[PDB]
Amino acid sequence: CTKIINADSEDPKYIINVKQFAKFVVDLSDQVAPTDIEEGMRVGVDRN
Amino acid sequence: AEVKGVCTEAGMYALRERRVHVTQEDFEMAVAKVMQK
Amino acid sequence: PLLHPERFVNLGIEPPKGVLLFGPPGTGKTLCARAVANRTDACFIRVIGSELVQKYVGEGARMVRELFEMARTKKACLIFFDEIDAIGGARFDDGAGGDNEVQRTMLELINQLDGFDPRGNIKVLMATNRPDTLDPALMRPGRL
Amino acid sequence: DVLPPEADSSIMMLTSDQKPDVMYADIGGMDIQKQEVREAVELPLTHFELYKQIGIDPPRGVLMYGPPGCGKTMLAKAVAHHTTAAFIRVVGSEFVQKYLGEGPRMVRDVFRLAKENAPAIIFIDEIDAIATKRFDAQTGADREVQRILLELLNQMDGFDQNVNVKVIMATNRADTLDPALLRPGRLDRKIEFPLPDRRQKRLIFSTITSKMNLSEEVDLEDYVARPDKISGADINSICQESGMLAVRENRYIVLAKDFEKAYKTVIKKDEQEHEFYK
Amino acid sequence: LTKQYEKSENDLKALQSVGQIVGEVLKQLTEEKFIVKATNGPRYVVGCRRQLDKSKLKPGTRVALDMTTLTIMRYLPREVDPLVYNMSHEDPGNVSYSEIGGLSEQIRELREVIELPLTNPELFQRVGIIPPKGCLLYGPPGTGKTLLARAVASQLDCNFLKVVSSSIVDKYIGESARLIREMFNYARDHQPCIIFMDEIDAIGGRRFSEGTSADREIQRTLMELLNQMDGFDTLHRVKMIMATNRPDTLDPALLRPGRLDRKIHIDLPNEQARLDILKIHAGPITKHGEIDYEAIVKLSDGFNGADLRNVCTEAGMFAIRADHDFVVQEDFMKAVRKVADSKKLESKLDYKPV
Amino acid sequence: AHHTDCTFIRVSGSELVQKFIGEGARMVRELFVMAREHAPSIIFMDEIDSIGSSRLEGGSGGDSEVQRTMLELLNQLDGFEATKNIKVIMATNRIDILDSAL
Amino acid sequence: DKIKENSEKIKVNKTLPYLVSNVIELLDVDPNDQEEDGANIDLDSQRKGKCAVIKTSTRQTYFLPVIGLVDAEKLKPGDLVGVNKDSYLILETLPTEYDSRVKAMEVDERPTEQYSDIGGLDKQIQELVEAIVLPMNHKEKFENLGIQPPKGVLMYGPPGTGKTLLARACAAQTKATFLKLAGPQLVQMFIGDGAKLVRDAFALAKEKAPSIIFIDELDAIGTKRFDSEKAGDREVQRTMLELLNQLDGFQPNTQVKVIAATNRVDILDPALLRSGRLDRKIEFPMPNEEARARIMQIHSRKMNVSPDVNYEELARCTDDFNGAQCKAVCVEAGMIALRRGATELTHEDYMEGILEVQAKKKANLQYYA
């Protein structure tokens, strides 16, 4: 699990932090559409 | 509690006299200095 | 309003989203609260009146924040408060070194209750035995 | 591999260019405590057997205190210049970092550094940040503060009763401390640095006024007459302000009106009483 | 082709570069063994290249390291800690001492503490007296203590530093005194520096006794600043300026001379002092040439040095009403009575000096 | 202690023991064990226990694993002795902070 | 084709999972004496360009000689860059992100309230438009006279008179980035975190250059500072002293306009009544006669009203009321018609609403007159 902070435009490109590990910039997988992916809610992230 | 400090600083004043003695005047100055504080 | 949103639409009025209960002790305020929570057709959320008084500074405002956000997430919940004197009704300043943190909690409640995009389709129930040492901001209608 | 006995300490010694150039004779009117701190540091290096044949149990530490500005830091600054043994100075509130146990870890690094280097003098100014009696308030931060004291109190007991690592530390308020710090087996010797008197005011005034001009029309004992509760630092502020006043008039010679304006500038905020009470 | 080709080959060149680890050197073990500490954690022993001038690699310096082999690469200057960067080269330009008026006595007393010992250091030596270190400003609000600091800031611009005195605290048990470490170490590196500590009463204050563990960290930030003021290592060409509204609540160890040599008092302006303040503020006003400032200054007693700026602002507001463009003296008399109406719900300041 | 023909045991036990937080919970254990196994003796203990705890306000506050120490001492002070061979003497100052009513 | 293959190889390396980090400062490395051939190194003396030092999100500060696919002149210390995961080389420059509490208070719903619904106070709405709306719309009108824009407005009074209407009115009209801030939101858990909060709050107002920040219930944080004890007041006074310096003093700003409101003013510190903090002091008295008849006319616009009611009689009978209480008369009157089922109202519907609003207890006052 991770927390999202900021979303970019057109391309998703989400800024994210885990809890205390580090902060990253990531993408969403093909399993879920980019609609219920708004800022300020916890999202699960593949460990690899 | 101050009596212990009287004996240690009496030993201090005896040590400043460069003697193994602990004289009466050491105790007089001991009482005076400890009482002062 | 929670079961017939038809009369008020055609008559064009608004319901009083805040109602205060008061009287002598042991008269039925608790029974009226349980009776409201009986057939509510909705989500009911109870509040212990002294739960918000906490040791660290500013955390009671966080409870009020999370409480009203949980209220906004679902549709048409009902807030119940009991023993509102613990949350705070006085505004003392006579050498104001006494209670100030619980005044801050009351102020964050007082702000989240009304003004600048209000809450929506939620209702507030309050109950106390001494409704004379209360804040005049609380007794102002639009909240009570 | 085995390193040389001090490799990582993350704290260095007083080097050779860090001597703060304060002479012993620069200090005026402290001979009741200059002589006391001289015999409490370098004298028991040689004469250690005299304690055992009399029974004083020779001290390890000495704690200075007084009103803020009676000459506490300068005496420790003075003995840094005229020592032949090594000297180590540490900030009293530098082992408060935001990790788990780096506080007790670097405290152990100090006393390991002090033991193996030389019979050195460890000076830790302002221990009020750490040496509070207090209580175990469960907040998440006080337990590291208490265990720093527990690490400090454990390491001040059992060296060998022979190693000449002398400890010196100083506060301004020696009241909000744990009583075990003022207990035997630890820092025992007590010195107070009070406000000066008429004779010590003369000695401080003569030493400070020995480097600028002071044309002979300036009386010096007349400013000594008014008591005014004058600390050690107020004498230096009087001489600076009188000098700066003469600087402002493009003058290299200090006059009697310069000392009067300095006296009004430094100390005037005392006249606050009503007449009818007496 | 065009520059799209030359930008691409430099783009592909740059990707083959790798990072380097930043660390500090503890001591020199042998001529080829060096013990270093990576700042994130663990320490190591490393070696130099061959030609890094190993006399320069002194204990305490900062140096870069390779990733895989972990060897010494290149020495670097001391860190700057970019919180300190945000308070160093951030002040916009200001006009000189002409705008501040009525404080010409307090202007010159600050000039003799700051500008004179660095511009003319010989004259203090000739007498033979160390110049004063720092000064303290205090008084009722709105008389221009911060504006006085802006006047000194845009005067030579030596190394001016602006402390907010509320970002000194943080969420951890450390990092508050540690920022003050890097600030004065930045002050030691650039020798003619000026520290400005506005609103000291947040970080400062008195000494408590078993108040709260929260107050223990605020105190631990406090007497550390006492320690780095004079302490063991004395300062050179470093002057600190600090201002507040309540001088009575400060610590006596903070207010002792040596750390604050001269206390400068700024008071409510007098009749002629309010007059030329009004002359400065009514400068760029397209007034009709009938304005008499003497009657305006008569019905303003106990005003600050800033309510007169509000008086000049409010007169244009009445000019904005019916867009009269030119400002008439009747609007000055009307706006004065409006401001003095508002100046009845905030008073009784009169704090004790020092 | 000398005139009653018993050995004298002095307990320093102020704060060096409690550095390993729960060592006090064993400090009152093993000490009493030696005072039960050595001889007819007395135990001397200072003000510090009152410094260690007052009551169970730290039971809802944290106990810092010291009041529990007091609690541990409490049961081992109660136990089953009826003199036997172990007795205790309390020396203290400022008696009105601890919980002597229980 | 040849250049586009190199363009294809660049976008291959920057995949997507970039670690983010902070730039500590920018350096520049001079060459050395003589670099030996056969042992020379490119990432050394032979680099006259720029360089940077980067602290990663894992609290490990690294170094890079080549800045990479970013222009060096755009980068400033304190920024956020999207470095790689293996080479740890700078790839992208991101927009700066803020605290999560700061990211929630932007006025996005855009409420709609006209000025005609606050009938009764037209004197106060005249200057409130004057101190706000004119600077971001007519810069040239103020500049032709050339004095200063206003800085801050304090609105206060008894709590029923109506002040949050004017705050909601200005968010309805102006197209500027209205920003909403509460009183007790600034009081936080640990030490710090309020100084960081206000500084982040003003920073968000900086980029959105026409902006209004609104602070409600200022008597929460901003109480009278005195000699006291504990840590509850000292943290609030720490955040208040942060607020005063960031509002006026060092680094003055025109682009941020602050609006404050309260219900008492005796508690506020006199340093809030200084130069640029609070420029105008605005009263809000209780409605007298015609304001009360104006209030009931506004609120009963939606309701079906029988057209034989005269509001002057209601306004005469209703005494020591406010805007909210006269609002509660109209809602209560409309229900009384619903209790008996009548659609249009009457006069006696209003009077029974009046008797309910006054909340008179059981009296037994039958020994009078």
Ligand SMILES: Nc1ncnc2c1ncn2[C@@H]1O[C@H](COP(=O)(O)OP(=O)(O)OP(=O)(O)O)[C@@H](O)[C@H]1O
């Ligand atoms: N009208 C009623 N009909 C039936 N039972 C009643 C009625 N009024 C009160 N009671 C009984 O009174 C009991 C105790 O009163 P209750 O719990 O309602 O207190 P309350 O009025 O909320 O007062 P307080 O909060 O001041 O203690 C209830 O358990 C209920 O059975």
Ligand SMILES: Nc1ncnc2c1ncn2[C@@H]1O[C@H](COP(=O)(O)OP(=O)(O)OP(=O)(O)O)[C@@H](O)[C@H]1O
């Ligand atoms: N005996 C003395 N003669 C001359 N100047 C003195 C004397 N004692 C102190 N001073 C002055 O005191 C200052 C040195 O610091 P100070 O003695 O006030 O430190 P301190 O006593 O440790 O104080 P604090 O606890 O406030 O830090 C200098 O300004 C110095 O001139």
Ligand SMILES: Nc1ncnc2c1ncn2[C@@H]1O[C@H](COP(=O)(O)OP(=O)(O)OP(=O)(O)O)[C@@H](O)[C@H]1O
């Ligand atoms: N003069 C007025 N005319 C019409 N409605 C008014 C008036 N004054 C207040 N209201 C009503 O008051 C309600 C909003 O509360 P109000 O503006 O009175 O609170 P406030 O004084 O800003 O805040 P607080 O309760 O914190 O003191 C709205 O329903 C609005 O219709």
Ligand SMILES: Nc1ncnc2c1ncn2[C@@H]1O[C@H](COP(=O)(O)OP(=O)(O)O)[C@@H](O)[C@H]1O
């Ligand atoms: N002597 C003065 N002459 C002209 N304007 C002044 C003077 N003193 C203060 N001001 C006005 O006051 C403002 C500065 O206020 P501030 O810095 O808050 O004062 P302080 O910090 O002393 O309270 C400036 O905008 C300036 O217009």
